[PDB]
Amino acid sequence: VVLSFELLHAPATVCGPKKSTNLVKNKCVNFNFNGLTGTGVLTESNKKFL
Amino acid sequence: NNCTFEYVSQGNFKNLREFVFKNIDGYFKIYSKHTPINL
User: Fold this and answer.
1) Which H or E run contains B23?
2) B35: Cβ–Cβ under 8 A, 6 or more apart, which residues?
3) A9–B26 CB contact, under 8 Å
4) Is B14 left (phi over 0), alpha (psi -120 to 50) or beta?
5) Does any CB of chain A come closer than 8 Å to the CB of residue B6?
6) Quick one: which H or E segment has residue B8?
7) Does B11 lie at the interface with A, CB-CB under 8 angstroms?
8) B26 part of contact set with chain A, CB < 8 Å
């Protein structure tokens, strides 16, 4: 079975997951939700979503 | 010839099927939104 690593001019749509996380307010840690990082408190906040 | 890619999932103006099509870097984005426009 062949796995071809072509990173050509066309966009890369082949990535992969690892591990697990569970972060709660009143603490202050990192985060990574499909790429975006940052350092701070992760509160299960009262905000909207769509 | 080739199938290089594929994918599978009153009448007074009940809705509208409008779609914008654009291309960047080759990758193509379909946009669909079936807005109900009874007017």
Assistant:
1) strand B21-24
2) B15, B16, B18
3) yes
4) alpha
5) no
6) none
7) no
8) yes
